[PDB]
Scaffold this motif. Sequence first.
Motif, mmCIF file in Angstrom:
data_model
loop_
_atom_site.group_PDB
_atom_site.id
_atom_site.type_symbol
_atom_site.label_atom_id
_atom_site.label_comp_id
_atom_site.label_asym_id
_atom_site.label_seq_id
_atom_site.Cartn_x
_atom_site.Cartn_y
_atom_site.Cartn_z
ATOM 1 N N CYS A 250 0.791 -1.226 0.000
ATOM 2 C CA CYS A 250 0.000 0.000 0.000
ATOM 3 C C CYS A 250 0.824 1.277 0.000
ATOM 4 O O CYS A 250 0.799 2.031 -0.978
ATOM 5 N N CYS A 253 2.016 3.081 5.087
ATOM 6 C CA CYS A 253 1.348 2.068 5.896
ATOM 7 C C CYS A 253 1.997 0.707 5.703
ATOM 8 O O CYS A 253 2.134 -0.067 6.656
ATOM 9 N N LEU A 254 2.392 0.398 4.470
ATOM 10 C CA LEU A 254 2.917 -0.911 4.085
ATOM 11 C C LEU A 254 1.921 -2.021 4.354
ATOM 12 O O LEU A 254 2.316 -3.178 4.522
ATOM 13 N N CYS A 255 0.636 -1.694 4.423
ATOM 14 C CA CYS A 255 -0.372 -2.737 4.340
ATOM 15 C C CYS A 255 -0.171 -3.483 3.036
ATOM 16 O O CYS A 255 -0.146 -2.886 1.954
ATOM 17 N N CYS A 266 -6.699 2.360 2.143
ATOM 18 C CA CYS A 266 -6.395 0.935 2.245
ATOM 19 C C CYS A 266 -6.965 0.365 3.534
ATOM 20 O O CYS A 266 -6.992 1.057 4.561
ATOM 21 N N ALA A 268 -6.055 -0.928 5.977
ATOM 22 C CA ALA A 268 -5.271 -0.841 7.202
ATOM 23 C C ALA A 268 -4.969 0.587 7.631
ATOM 24 O O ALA A 268 -4.885 0.841 8.836
ATOM 25 N N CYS A 269 -4.815 1.525 6.703
ATOM 26 C CA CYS A 269 -4.526 2.910 7.031
ATOM 27 C C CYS A 269 -5.507 3.812 6.299
ATOM 28 O O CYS A 269 -5.778 3.621 5.111
#
Lengths: 284, 460, 66, 344, 351
Positions: A250, A253-255, A266, A268-269
């Motif tokens: 993503c 966030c690195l989701c 996304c 997650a963030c």
Amino acid sequence: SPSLLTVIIEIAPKLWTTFDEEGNEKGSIIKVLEALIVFLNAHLAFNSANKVAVIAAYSQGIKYLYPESTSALXXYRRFRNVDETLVEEIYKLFELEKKQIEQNSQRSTLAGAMSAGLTYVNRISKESVTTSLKSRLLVLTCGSGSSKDEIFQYIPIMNCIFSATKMKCPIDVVKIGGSKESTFLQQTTDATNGVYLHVESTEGLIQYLATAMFIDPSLRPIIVKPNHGSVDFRTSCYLTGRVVAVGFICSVCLCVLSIIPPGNKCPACDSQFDEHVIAKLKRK
Amino acid sequence: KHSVTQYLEEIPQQVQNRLYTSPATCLAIYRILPPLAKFFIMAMVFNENEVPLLDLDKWVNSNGKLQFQNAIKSMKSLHLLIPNKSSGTLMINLNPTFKISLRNALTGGEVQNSFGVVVEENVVSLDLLDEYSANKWETILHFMVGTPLAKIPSEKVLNLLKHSKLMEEVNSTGEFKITNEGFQFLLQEINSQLWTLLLQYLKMIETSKMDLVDVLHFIFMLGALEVGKAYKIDALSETQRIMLQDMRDYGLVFQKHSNDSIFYPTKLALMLTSDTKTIRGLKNQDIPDGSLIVETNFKIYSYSNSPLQIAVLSLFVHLKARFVNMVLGQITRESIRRALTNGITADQIIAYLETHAHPQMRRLAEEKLEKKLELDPNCKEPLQVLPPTVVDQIRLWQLELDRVITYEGSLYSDFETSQEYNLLSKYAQDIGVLLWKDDKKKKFFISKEGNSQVLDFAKR
Amino acid sequence: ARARKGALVQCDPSIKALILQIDAKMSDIVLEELDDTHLLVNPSKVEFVKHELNRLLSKNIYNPMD
Amino acid sequence: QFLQWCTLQPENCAVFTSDNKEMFQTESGLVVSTYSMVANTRNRSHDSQKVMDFLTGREWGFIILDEVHVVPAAMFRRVVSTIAAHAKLGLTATLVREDDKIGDLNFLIGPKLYEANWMELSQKGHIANVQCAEVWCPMTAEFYQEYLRETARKRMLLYIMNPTKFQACQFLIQYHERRGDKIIVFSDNVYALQEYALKMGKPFIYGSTPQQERMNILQNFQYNDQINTIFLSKVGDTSIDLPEATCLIQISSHYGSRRQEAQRLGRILRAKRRNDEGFNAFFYSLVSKDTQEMYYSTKRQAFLVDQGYAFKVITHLHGMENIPNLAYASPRERRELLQEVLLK
Amino acid sequence: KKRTAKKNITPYQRGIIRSLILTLDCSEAMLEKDLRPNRHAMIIQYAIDFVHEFFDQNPISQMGIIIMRNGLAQLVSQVSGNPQDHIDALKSIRKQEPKGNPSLQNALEMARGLLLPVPAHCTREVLIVFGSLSTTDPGDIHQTIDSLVSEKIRVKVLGLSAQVAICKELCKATNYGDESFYKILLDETHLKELFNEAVTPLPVNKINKGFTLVKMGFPTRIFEDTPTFCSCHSKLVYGGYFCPNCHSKVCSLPTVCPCCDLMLILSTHLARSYHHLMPLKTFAEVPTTEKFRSEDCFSCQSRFPXXXXXXXXXXXXXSRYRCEDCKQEFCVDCDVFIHEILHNCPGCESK
DNA sequence: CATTGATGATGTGACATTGATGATGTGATG
DNA sequence: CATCACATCATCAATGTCACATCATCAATG
Ligand SMILES: [Zn+2]
Ligand SMILES: [Zn+2]
Ligand SMILES: [Zn+2]
Ligand SMILES: [Zn+2]
Ligand SMILES: [Zn+2]
């Protein structure tokens, strides 16, 4: 070359309950304690008085098992005392088990115990500038289910990975549980150079102990004994949950996500992505 | 060095298994082993099935099979195993006495001699009778090396030293100076000297009232733990008891007087095995009590002292007067020519000053070691680690003083072919038994190692 | 085992030659010679060998420190 | 050598201290002088004694002295007794001297103010990167039979003559021509030195010289690279405008005394401004190995490191025989060379 | 007695994929005798140190290195994702010696030309290292500064014992006004600390620019040993990685694909970034007499903390620096090593 | 071929050395 | 025991021993 043996053996009477529950009730983890005690005596014999330690995870915490925290305030005569100390410790921890202990079944304190072990190891290694130990650890798990892949603790597990790698520390693993390859610990030992022990219960582990987990302290010129392959097609899309191979990663966030992304924000963030950039992504 | 492991192997097989009878001896002799061998032992102790060699051949990946053969040849040397051409293979199996005694020790064996001491109220503090042990050991150091009074009343101890021709003076006239053996005694610090004299005690009593395996069990119990209570009272044979009483006379027994007690485990025998930080009326001043000054000035600069160590220093140097924290001494060509009169090679002394007197050259070896090891290939030139100008003038002096250089050993003969001479010549490039040789002469004047390993290979 | 007990002295062939000169002088107490770089000696005379070694070599050199 | 670059005009200081017959007593300005009739009691002129009495007549408010040490003080004590001055100056040369009598000329002139410090003038920019060396020229048995033939100092050049020494020095010459370095060679001998100087055959320096060609070889040494080897005779000391050192070779090794060598070196390693090499100043002591002078070379390096400069030995010559002009390399030609040095 | 960052703002978004370019000055200035060996060689030293530091802590970023000499600036490293290229470049430099003076403008402009192919997610920062007292420009300076900070490139400079307010003004420009980047030093310990903080990703109060996804895939280790063959160096490769789609072989590297040009790491690097995502609340030193907790360490086991009133000594530092969200202890070395290497708050990870 | 000058020559000063001869220690002795 | 007498040791001072020091002589220079 004195070395430190930091064995990490979890004792969850939940995991131990599964331990008995799998197969017959023909022998408790008492056998595991025994094989470990013998192995610890063995490793202590191995070098000229090379230090060791062990900790275990409660259902609701942990405690230094070898070290004998400040509480006052045979064979070599010393294997006796170390093991006996340990036995008093572990049984007294078995007083620390009841319905309230039968409550704290949310998390798995494996990672925190791992880190604290690393911390005390480093406390020696930085404290022991003279007589620099070439040390390493072992993990033990009476493996079970009811939580297929606890993902919460995975991050600091990686953090411990790097902690050891930079700290230059071999870390070998013995999971004793159902036919489940703990990919967390799998890739952990994989990169961080341990040996994978996915075993069955009632076998007298002594053989595997004395064989597979005597390599590192100074040696490592021997063919390691891992399990089958250690693929790095890592954790799944945070949304989909099916293990992902070609990254759709993503942001800051690195989701890590699938072909899903909601077009924005996304899962997650709370951070949007240009919908035209989404068109660039779906240009495939 | 005679390498006490080699003396262990030296005894024949039946007496070796006579000594595996004590699992405590089993473990102690296990602990001298190469980690190669140590690990392979631990591998074999419990897979109750003998094993072919090729498994251990495939154990080692690339370079390191050297120590593999170290392990196998040494273990063969003390015959702890029995090689077995059963199916034409090498069906490796230990001495089941050795393996079973060790295994019992692994899970509470029946080696009561391993714990012949008793847990009683041991009044021995660290300093408790200790400083007495250090006083007596320093006393033997001074008396043998030559004290202002060579106060060694150990007529038995002096007899043990002389019977092997250890310290060389006019012994008939009473002279016992540091001989070649005595100079080497000036060299073998604790493990060196302690082991040379443990074997000297071996030699003094080796035929009459020997009880060889029993005496060895006493030796290993001494090296094992503080005997504490009931050690001398119970856990000893009368012969082993006499050996322990002599060891107390030799300091090696740290028990009180009056000839009635448990074994007082002085640190001497503990260290004899342990080989670690070697420090043993009611005073003691370390760690920097060791004193010296040795830098690239080729001169002594000492503040701390140890009159035994100052005697050692005075050996290889001149002196004029003793002072506050230093003594009058400058090291020169002549100063070490002195030792060379005793022939005493200044080849021990190099690593000796890298061992001794660093207790006052700590900044010296930290400035001149510099941790120039990771930096060894980074910045190529080593940074006076260790000081090579000192070694250069020392070494150079030896070369100068090497005009009529002499060799040890004897001139071997009966060499016929270049096959086994190529073989024995390279294997002497390998075990280092060779100084010079030539097939052309079929001649060389060396020690009998080449001979030993070729003599053993040819006969058995 | 096969060998001959001795005191093997090795040096440059010139120094060997001088040694053997002084040896021929001292009733020639070199038990044998192996080559120009090798000699076989007995430590019941080699120290006196060093004695006259130093004697004549200093008589020649005399080391004036000048 | 200095004072005309300096701030004086030559017209006033009359050098008939004892030297000439010069303008005594008419020097409007100062006088530069020595100790050679002031009292070197061979005053045969009286213009000599006249410069004495004239030094007496005018009250010399200051006196600048140089190295009076070798001179017996007695003469200078008499002369300063004659001058009736009221101050002086003494520039010392050595630390403890022979005019250090019950009257040290120190309290005669005044206190010590400064002292020499080599370690401070040869590790920065003045005389930095200073390294010494003592090559052990491979022995050959002819030197050893000379050692055997005689115990006389006649053996001095008999070991100095070593052709392998010439070969080591010749590699150094090809090397410093290759390095662009400057090569100083010291040799008190005459014969074997000129044999080598012919053997090398560049415009070279020897004893006995008339000297405008020595100016030629000083410049074409400080000015030309085709010629890159000069041989410094003991005629160099004393005193000359001492060459700076980029590669000093010393052959003669008696040079008594030890402090004579001291002044010699503190003069030869003159302030050298070349920093291209990691060790810009190489000191070489070509001493034939296994010889009489082994003890003297060891003493030489001992005194060397007694006073600061880096020292080493590279006896492993890179192509020691790959060097060209392998003259007299044969032990046999070495023998003929020793014959000639017996004749010289 | 504390000198501590009161508010450790880190819970946001820092600059992760940084296209870092150290610039060097190899001039007669770097010779001068104020530092122990010199400025110059010491700078080479600590630069090598930073190469290792950075590529460790920022193991997913790239780098190129440039020096300045004789009124000219000189690159020493192409944009490289292998540390050793930088390492041996620095070696090859240390033996070369400084001359002349820095032509600051040329270095700035060379860097400007360099970082252009860097995409958005790849962020742009240069790294001055300065020890001179003047520059040499051939091109209008604030002109090029305008171009630079108009193309979104903050820079951190480390001058030596002086101040040059053009550096502060240019940085303040590049750093959106707010300035902290003209850190100069007065000591060598000081120097290395400067480096270590230069390593970390750098936020201030981010300009809310484009947050773009990054796509990639992951290769896989090889099986055959003899099958040595390479496509990134065209050499022998006895076993390595296998592009997830392009399926080429790649010798060990975290690099971008050399066939279809996509990034290749495993996961570890993401985890380092996360360690830089939510660092922890600082371990507060427990109040002296009001703490009265168990008398040892938790993370380690350190029974020392006080001597219980020695009038002055014990009443000094009742040192029980214990966490905030977990309030679980850890001794001074434990605090330092937790917060240093493995932030990994177990007491906070514990529950 | 006159001239002037650089460099050997041999005169002379200054101190190390060795030795002849007094000095005072000691044996013989009445 | 007080005395003188031989007996080695101390001290001025010649001897010689060398070293600087002006003067002589071939020989280039102009
Ligand atoms: Zn996200
Ligand atoms: Zn490649
Ligand atoms: Zn690709
Ligand atoms: Zn702690
Ligand atoms: Zn916390």
